[PDB]
Design a protein around this nucleic acid. Structure first.
Lengths: 184, 193, 270, 130, 170, 47, 98
RNA sequence: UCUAAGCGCGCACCCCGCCUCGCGCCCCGCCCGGCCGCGCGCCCCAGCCCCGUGCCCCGUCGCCGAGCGGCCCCCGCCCGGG
RNA sequence: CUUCGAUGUCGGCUCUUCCUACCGUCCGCGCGCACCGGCGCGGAAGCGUCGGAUUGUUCACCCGUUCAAGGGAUCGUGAGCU
RNA sequence: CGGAACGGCGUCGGCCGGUCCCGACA
């Protein structure tokens, strides 16, 4: 008789539909689809309040209701307001040069520690890379999916790595200034 | 003829091996979709570990390892069969193992063994992986080919289904006949079947 | 105990078994990749090695001692007589691999290709292709087979024969080989290109370009039974060694109690 | 987990046990893996049976708490659920399955011939349609 | 498993004309185990060995199974490290049935056999006092839970019917 | 470098806890290391 | 034959009754189709069965005697002991008498 | 909070390709025959869409034809030169 | 314990394979990590671990170089040698 | 999976000492 249930009130602007464990959220910025068929979940639409509900929560099935609930809420805020990760380039001596090679779909970084290697990072589909005039050496990543934009920003941070040296002494690279929830 | 899609390899093999010893001829299709329980990380290590044992002096005289998902199933059943004996060799001869549904077994009637199937055999939360993916990693090169031919065969099977549906309706219209007497006896004589 | 001193093994185990080649001549096995959307081209040609020459050339390798200098290099001339296409074969990428979807032969096959199909031409029935020429020669039968290849074949190849008469060697039978047609927009475009070349000589200039790199497949020179010093490149033992020095001294350990496939042993050399 | 909950009064079908093949009502939950079942009109006596034997039918009987046996029989008799289940596909099959069990080796012979008459009659019907 | 109230006394002696009659309630599979467990407790508690004592009666108690009742058992068990005390609540129809449930859970989780577990107290706990969450879960009147194991039915049916035309839906 | 940039850079390169046995970068408030599963964490020596 | 019209219930001769060490070739373990339980075997007990000899194409008559195990296999005795090349071959439990 | 679900990257290692061999098999040629079998939905299982069956007779009366799916058959040397 | 009507005794030379308890190169992480260069750790056995002086010597010590881990296989290897 | 002292916020089951609506400075 044990159920770990978490209920999230769907925003009126968002229109979402759940078939099986596939949740499809429609929003003003765009439409997103996630699949949670890995976990055993009894997600019930029930108008605004969506109950994830995991029956018989033995051990880590007690963690599934809140994780899935939060993901479906991230989906809601992604397609209503959009996620805006900001990335700050941190040059000590040689200014790293960033160019948006595609239609906001690729970023190329040069002169990182005077490296001849050119790092081109292709963005995940549905995320746009921009350059911010106000901050200076700031990249703006904008998408409707929290994971897609964050994975792109992690890839940019990894693409620029000091090979050896002391990391505590040489602190150069893109380091993610702001988490997001501002623009599509 | 057994569709192996979704069947635990050992549980299916135990059923197949006794059936082959009992003189039944068994043909297995969609062998690539049989499921081995446990994480791919460890299932693949356990298939690489077995491919390590080869006769040091000549590997041509050593244990052979079959990358093919259908030949993996055969080797499993061979372990559960007295192959060295002539009784065992004959039951191995009646086994036919095939990745994908081949043209030879395309129109044969396929049965499933629900006990062997993974959905009833392993808890949800237990990681499981098809033998087709372990095969590709150990070195099977026909996964793309077997998928291309399976997808096109399923498009044809869809067209056949629609014709089958219309044919089945036209059999039901003719299900009125002496069949009614057979029905009366096979139920209303208390027989019940 | 350990080997005491570190030394590599002698020979590539990948080239075992070192046996006389069963295949009559060099075989292509894997052709170059199709690269669909490229220009339609033939990937292979057969020729007979004539001999070497030595040429002086101007090196333009930037970043080298020879940049803007002249070098004398060994060059091998391979006499390549034109090869006449005699048949088109189409293969499909089945779950069991490339499987032939039939070969359509030409309406008229040359005498050198015919000679290949018999052990002795003079004392032979000469019955090969007799029915086929009657079925064909109108082109209708050939066209139906080409259409079947367009519908079911994924890889198109041409079967061509070297004309041995144009070469100095004492052969008379032609060597027949399959040359993969590559660079096709469609399989049917590949069949059309192949049909144009049917019963038609193909030239090296129209297969390969100057400055391009090729892979040369052939059976090597033979030396017959050779010793492990001149077969595997093992060290000759000191001249004090009784019972001869041209031998591997220890062919293995007590355990495994059977000689291994690694250990060097005398046999066929070329 | 959408429907067919293990609740009080749910009609149950015994898949295994001495009373296999019969319907019962869950009088009370003993645990996650056991229930107290009793079916007086179906002849199942009150016992605690593992939920692993019980199969949940779609019908639920409206009963009072602590049903007892006599009050439970009165409630089961009032409910139309028992007959609704029997008229349903599972119930009609359950009735056929009971008749199949009451069959001797001789009644297997008559049932095997009749089945082969069906096998060949169906082939004649199928061929004639085509 | 059966529930036996066993009575026993020391043999009557010139030193004491009527020794004290002792009464214990022992849950055992049979009467011979119940009289053995009686003397094991009597030997330690009152220094009475079986040779020095008599069994006045071993009365078997019959318990009604009409209603599920919350039961509470206080026991002591020996693990390899040393002895420990443990309170377990189980909801069962009869007290013997609840003791069987307690013995099976102790064997399954604590790996303790019948002989190394002594049952200090077995009581019927009220619905209000249920320290164990599991018993408290079913105590509330409305307890709709989806079938815990509907996979078992299809797997069991498939033992007789090894080969089926379709894979069964649960 | 700009001072804020040095701070931001430090969050990912200087602020972490290293379990002595596992030598694994670990969260600042980590009771047990992700890989070593041990309580002997240290605060990462400053430059 | 004498079994030409007899309807028969299908079965297989799986093996002789045996232990890993010792095999009793006198009793033959037969699996009867439709019998999956030991109680169900009682229906087929004391029934005339026949296995067609491969060499002569002639039925070897036998009678089912006792149940072999809880899974419905039965122990049967035949006029001649079975050759052993007939393992896995079908035996016929006739629904009609003799 | 890098992990529990989920996800990205990732080793001179591993596996594969390229290569060395290769049982068999495929296509064609010559020749163009014999033999044998009769039986197709798919997906999913925390929607499981109504389940919890069917088959239960490979001779036991079934064998036509057709359509598919197979199997078999068959291809010399001596001699001279390399 | 087994081998005495017999299992060729060390070191070298030759040649093969294997192990990791990895010295260098590979992948990370740490440092009393500015760089250079060390050092510690986890994965990693693909490749390299040589040329000589004295000594029967394994060992040892020394010179030199692209600076040089440790072992196992009847103390691998005598119808192979010396 | 022969195995030790020692570790483990892996998952369960207890034992004991406490604090929760004097919300476990507002």
């Amino acid at each position: 008789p044990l159920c770990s249930s978490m209920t999230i009130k769907v925003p009126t602007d968002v229109e979402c539909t759940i078939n099986k464990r596939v949740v499809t959220v429609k929003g003003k910025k765009g439409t997103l689809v996630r699949d949670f068929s890995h976990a055993p979940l009894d997600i019930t639409h029930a108008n605004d309040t969506i109950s994830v509900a995991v029956w018989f929560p033995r051990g880590k099935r007690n963690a599934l209701p809140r994780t899935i609930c939060s993901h479906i809420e991230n989906m809601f805020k992604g397609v209503t307001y959009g996620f805006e990760y900001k990335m700050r380039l941190a040059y000590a001596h040689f200014p790293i040069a960033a160019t948006v090679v595609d239609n906001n779909k690729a970023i190329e970084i040069r002169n990182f520690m005077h490296q001849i290697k050119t790092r081109r990072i292709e963005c995940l589909p549905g995320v746009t890379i921009a350059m911010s005039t106000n901050v200076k050496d700031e990249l703006i990543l904008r998408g409707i999916s929290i994971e897609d934009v964050s994975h792109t920003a992690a890839r940019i941070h990894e693409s620029l790595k000091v090979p050896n040296k002391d990391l505590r002494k040489f602190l150069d690279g893109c380091y993610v200034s702001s988490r997001g929830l501002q623009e599509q | 003829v057994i569709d192996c899609k979704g069947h635990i390899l050992g549980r299916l093999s135990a059923i197949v091996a006794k059936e082959l010893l009992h003189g039944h001829e068994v043909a297995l299709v969609r062998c690539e979709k049989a499921i081995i329980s446990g994480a791919f990380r460890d299932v693949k290590a356990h298939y690489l570990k077995k491919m390590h044992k080869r006769t040091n002096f000549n590997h041509l005289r050593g244990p052979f390892h079959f990358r093919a998902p259908a030949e993996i199933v055969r080797r499993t059943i061979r372990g559960m069969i007295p192959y060295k004996t002539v009784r065992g060799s004959d039951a191995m001869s009646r086994l036919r193992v095939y990745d994908g549904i081949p043209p030879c077994c395309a129109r044969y009637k396929r049965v499933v063994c629900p006990s062997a199937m993974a959905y009833l055999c392993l808890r949800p939360e237990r990681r499981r992986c098809e033998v087709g993916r372990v095969a590709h990693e150990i070195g099977w090169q026909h996964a793309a080919d077997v998928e291309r031919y399976e997808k096109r065969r399923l498009e044809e099977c869809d067209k056949w289904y629609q014709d089958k549906i219309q044919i089945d309706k036209k059999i039901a219209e003719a299900a009125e006949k002496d069949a009614e007497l057979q029905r009366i006896n096979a139920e209303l004589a208390k027989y019940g079947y | 105990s350990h080997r005491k001193f570190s030394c590599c093994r002698k020979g590539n185990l990948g080239y075992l078994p070192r046996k006389r080649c069963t295949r009559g001549r060099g075989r292509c096995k894997t052709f170059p990749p199709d690269v669909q959307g490229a220009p339609i081209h033939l990937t292979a040609f057969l020729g007979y090695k004539a001999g070497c020459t030595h040429v002086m050339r101007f090196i333009d390798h930037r970043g080298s001692n020879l940049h803007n200098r002249q070098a004398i290099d060994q060059a091998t001339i391979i006499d390549a007589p034109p090869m006449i296409c005699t048949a088109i074969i189409g293969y499909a990428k089945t779950p069991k691999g490339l499987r032939a979807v039939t070969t359509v032969w030409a309406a008229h096959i040359a005498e050198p290709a015919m000679r290949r199909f018999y052990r002795n031409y003079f004392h032979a029935e000469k019955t090969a292709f007799s029915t086929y020429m009657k079925k064909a020669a109108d082109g209708t039968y050939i066209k139906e087979q080409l259409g079947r290849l367009k519908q079911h074949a994924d890889v198109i190849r041409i079967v061509a024969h070297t004309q041995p008469a144009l070469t100095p060697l004492k052969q008379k039978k032609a060597d027949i080989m399959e040359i993969q047609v590559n660079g096709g927009a469609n399989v049917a475009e590949k069949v059309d290109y192949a049909y144009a070349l049917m019963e038609k000589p193909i030239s090296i200039k129209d297969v390969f370009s100057v400055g391009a790199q090729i892979d040369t497949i052939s059976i090597t020179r033979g030396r017959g039974f050779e010793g492990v010093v001149t077969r595997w490149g093992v060290t000759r033992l000191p001249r004090k060694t009784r019972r001869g020095n041209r031998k591997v001294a220890c062919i293995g350990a007590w355990h495994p109690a059977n000689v291994q496939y690694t250990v060097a042993r005398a046999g066929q050399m070329g | 987990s959408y429907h067919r909950f293990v609740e009080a009064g749910r009609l149950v079908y015994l898949g295994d046990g001495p009373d296999k093949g019969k319907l019962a009502v869950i009088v009370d939950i003993l645990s996650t893996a056991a229930v107290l079942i009793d079916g007086p009109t179906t002849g199942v006596k009150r016992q605690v049976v593992s939920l692993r034997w019980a199969m949940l039918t779609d019908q639920v009987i409206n009963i009072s708490e602590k049903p007892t046996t006599e009050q439970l029989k009165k409630e089961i008799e009032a409910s139309p659920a028992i007959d609704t289940f029997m008229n349903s596909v599972w119930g009609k099959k359950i009735q056929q399955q009971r008749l199949r069990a009451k069959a001797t080796f001789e009644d297997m012979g008559k049932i095997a011939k009749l089945r082969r008459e069906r096998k060949m009659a169906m082939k004649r019907i199928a061929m004639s349609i085509k | 498993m059966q529930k036996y109230i066993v009575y026993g006394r020391r043999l009557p002696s010139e030193k004491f004309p009527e020794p004290e009659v002792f009464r214990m309630t022992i849950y055992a599979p049979n009467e011979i185990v119940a009289k053995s467990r009686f003397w094991y407790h009597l030997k330690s508690l009152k220094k009475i060995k079986r040779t020095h004592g008599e069994i006045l009666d071993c009365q078997h108690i019959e318990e009604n199974g009409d209603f599920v009742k919350n039961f509470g058992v206080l026991l002591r068990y020996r693990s390899r490290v040393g002895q420990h005390n443990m309170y377990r609540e189980v909801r069962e129809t009869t007290s013997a049935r609840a003791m069987d449930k307690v013995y099976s859970e102790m064997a399954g989780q604590c790996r303790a056999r019948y002989h190394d577990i002594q049952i200090i107290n077995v009581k019927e706990v009220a619905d209000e006092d249920v320290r164990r969450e599991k018993v408290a879960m079913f105590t509330q009147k409305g307890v709709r839970f989806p079938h815990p194991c509907p996979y078992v039915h299809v797997k069991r049916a498939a033992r007789t019917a090894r080969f089926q035309d379709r894979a069964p839906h649960v | 470098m700009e001072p804020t940039l040095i701070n931001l850079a430090r969050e990912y390169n200087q602020n972490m806890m290293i379990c002595r046995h596992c030598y694994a970068r670990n969260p600042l408030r980590a009771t047990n290391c992700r890989r070593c599963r041990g309580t002997n964490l240290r605060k990462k020596k400053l430059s | 034959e004498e079994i030409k019209g007899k309807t028969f219930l299908p079965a297989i001769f799986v093996g002789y009754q045996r232990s890993r060490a010792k095999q009793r070739e006198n009793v033959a373990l037969v699996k009867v189709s439709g019998i999956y339980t030991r109680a169900e075997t009682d229906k087929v007990l004391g029934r005339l069965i026949a296995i067609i000899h491969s060499k002569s194409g002639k039925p070897i008559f036998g009678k089912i005697c006792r149940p072999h195990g809880n899974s419905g296999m039965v122990r049967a005795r035949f006029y001649t002991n079975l050759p052993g090349q007939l393992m896995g071959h079908k035996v016929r439990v006739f629904y009609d008498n003799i």
